[PDB]
Ligand SMILES: C#CCN(Cc1ccc2[nH]c(N)nc(=O)c2c1)c1ccc(C(=O)N[C@@H](CCC(=O)O)C(=O)O)cc1
Ligand SMILES: C#CCN(Cc1ccc2[nH]c(N)nc(=O)c2c1)c1ccc(C(=O)N[C@@H](CCC(=O)O)C(=O)O)cc1
Ligand SMILES: *c1cc(=O)[nH]c(=O)n1[C@H]1C[C@H](O)[C@@H](COP(=O)(O)O)O1
C-alpha cells in the first residue's frame with residue numbers, strides 16, 4: 001500500500017541503529033501516523049501475499065477472551081507458540097483484558113460489551129476506548145501488549161478507529177495488525193448498522209530489524225495493486241458469534257509472499 | 265505556534281459538527297499528530313498569553329501523587345475546582361495512577377519511578393510507558409483522563425515523548441497540555457543527563473467548541489512570535505523535588521490574552 005511502503009522507506013532513510021532486546025539490532029523512528037480510508041478498500045498489503053487464516057482466528061480468539069493457544073492450535077495457527085508456557089497459556093494477554101479487566105476490588109470489566117453499548121447508546125462519546133495496557137498485570141503476561149490501546153469514533157454514520165501501537169516491526173507485524181483492526185471495524189460497524197470510516201494507525205517505536213533489510217528492498221521495488229474488498233457473509237446476533245467461514249476477500253491479487261525470520 | 269495554528273485551521277476546515285456530553289456542540293476531526301522539537305524553543309503558545317503558574321503547579325501536584333485540590337488552592341490555581349467534590353477530591357485521577365496504580369494482587373505501581381529506572385538502565389526499551397487510563401477505576405474518577413497515555417524514547421542521548429490525548433479541547437486544554445509535557449521531558453532529561461528530543465502529540469477526538477469560534481478566528485489572525493526559552497536553575501536530587509522557583513522562562517512576549525468558557 002502506498003502509505004505502508006512510504007513508512008518502510010522513512011525508516012530506512014531516517015532510523016537510528018539501536019541495539020535491541022534480541023541482540024539483532026533495529027533501525028528505528030519514533031512517531032508516525034497512517035490513515036486508511038476503509039471505503040476505498042480493505043488495507044491488506046498487496047506488495048506481498050498476506051494470509052488471512054491467522055489474522056481472522058486471532059481476532060475471534062481475542063473476542064472470546066481466551067489467552068490459551070489451544071483454539072489457535074485447533075485452527076492451525078502457530079504465531080504464539082514461542083511465548084506460550086509449558087501448558088499453553090500466555091497469562092492475561094489481549095483477550096483477558098478486552099473481556100475481563102480485573103478491578104482492584106476483584107470485579108471484572110468487559111470493555112468490548114461496554115464499547116458495544118456505547119456505540120448504540122452514546123455514539124458521540126469521546127471515551128469509546130479498549131485498553132490492553134493493564135499496568136498491574138503486565139508482569140504476569142508472556143509478552144507486554146504491542147497494540148496497546150484503541151479508540152473508536154462515530155461521525156456522519158461512519159465508524160473510525162485509531163490504534164496506538166507502542167512497538168512496531170514494520171516488515172512482519174505491521175501488515176498483520178493493520179488488517180486485524182480493519183477487520184474488527186467492519187465487524188463492529190455491521191453489528192451497529194453503521195458505515196466504515198477511517199482506520200488511523202499511530203506508532204511509538206517503529207522499526208525494521210537488521211535481518212529484514214534485503215526483504216524490505218525487495219518489497220519496496222514492487223508496485224502496489226488495487227485493494228481488495230471484504231465480504232461479511234452473515235450477520236450474527238452478536239460480535240461474539242462470528243466464525244471463520246463468514247469472511248470473504250474479493251479482488252486481492254498480491255505480489256508473491258516474501259519469507260523473513262522472526263526475532264524473538 | 266505554527267503547528268498549533270495549523271491544527272485549528274484543520275479542525276475548522278475538516279471538522280464535523282458533533283454534540284458533546286456537555287451539550288454545547290463541537291466541531292471535530294478524529295486523528296491528528298504533530299511534533300515539536302524541544303531544541304527549537306519551549307512550546308508555550310505566543311498568539312495569546314498563557315499563564316505558566318498553573319502549568320508548573322499542576323505538574324508538581326501530579327508528581328506528588330496528589331488528587332485533592334488544596335495544594336492547588338494555596339498556590340491559587342483554580343483550574344480544577346469545577347470538578348472537585350465537597351472535600352476537594354477528584355477521585356483516583358492522574359497523580360494517583362502515575363504514582364500508585366492499584367493492582368488486583370494488593371500491590372501499587374509507581375509508574376514515574378519505573379520510567380526513571382528504565383531511562384537509566386534500559387533506555388532502548390520499547391516499554392517506557394505511563395498510563396492514566398485505569399479502566400477498573402474510571403467510575404471513581406471525577407473526569408476520565410483526556411491525556412491518557414505517554415511513551416518515552418531515547419535516541420542519540422535525546423529524550424522524546426509521545427502523548428496520546430483521547431479528547432482534546434483545542435482552544436483551552438491543548439496549550440496547557442503541550443506546555444505540561446514539554447516541562448516533564450526537560451525535567452526527566454535533566455535528571456538523566458539527556459538532551460531534549462521531540463515532544464510528539466497525537467489526538468483522538470480533536471475539537472473546537474461552538475462558543476469558541478470567534479476567539480479561534482481572532483487567534484488565527486495573529487502571527488506567532490519566537491518561542492520562549494526554559495532555564496532550570498537547579499538539579500534536585502529527585503524528580504519529586506522540584507520547586508516552582510527552579511524554573512524561569514526567558515524571552516516570552518505573547519499577543520494579548522483571549523478569554524473563553526469551559527464546558528464542564
Ligand atoms: C503481529 C502479530 C502476531 N504474531 C506474533 C506476536 C509476537 C510478539 C508480540 N508482541 C507483542 N508485544 N504483542 C503481540 O501481539 C505479539 C504477537 C505474529 C507472528 C509471526 C508473524 C509472521 O512471521 N508472519 C509471516 C508469515 C506467517 C503468517 O502468515 O502468519 C510473514 O511473512 O508475514 C506474524 C504475526
Ligand atoms: C488542560 C488542562 C487543565 N485544565 C483541566 C481541564 C478539565 C476539563 C476540561 N474540560 C473542557 N471542556 N476543556 C478543557 O480544556 C478542560 C481542562 C484546565 C482547566 C481550566 C482552564 C482554563 O479555563 N484556563 C484559563 C486561564 C485562567 C486560569 O488560570 O484560571 C484559560 O483561559 O485558558 C485550563 C485548563
Ligand atoms: C481534558 C483534559 C485536559 O487536560 N485537556 C483537555 O483538552 N480535556 C478536554 C477534552 C474535552 O473537551 C473535555 C473532556 O470531555 P470528555 O470526557 O471527553 O467527554 O475536556
Ligand SMILES: O=c1ccn([C@H]2C[C@H](O)[C@@H](COP(=O)(O)O)O2)c(=O)[nH]1
Pocket residue numbers: 021144146147167168169170173174177390391
Ligand atoms: O502487533 C505486533 C506484535 C509484535 N510486534 C513486535 C514489536 C517488537 O519487534 C516486538 C515486541 O517486543 P518489545 O518491544 O516488548 O521488546 O514484537 C509488532 O510490531 N506488532
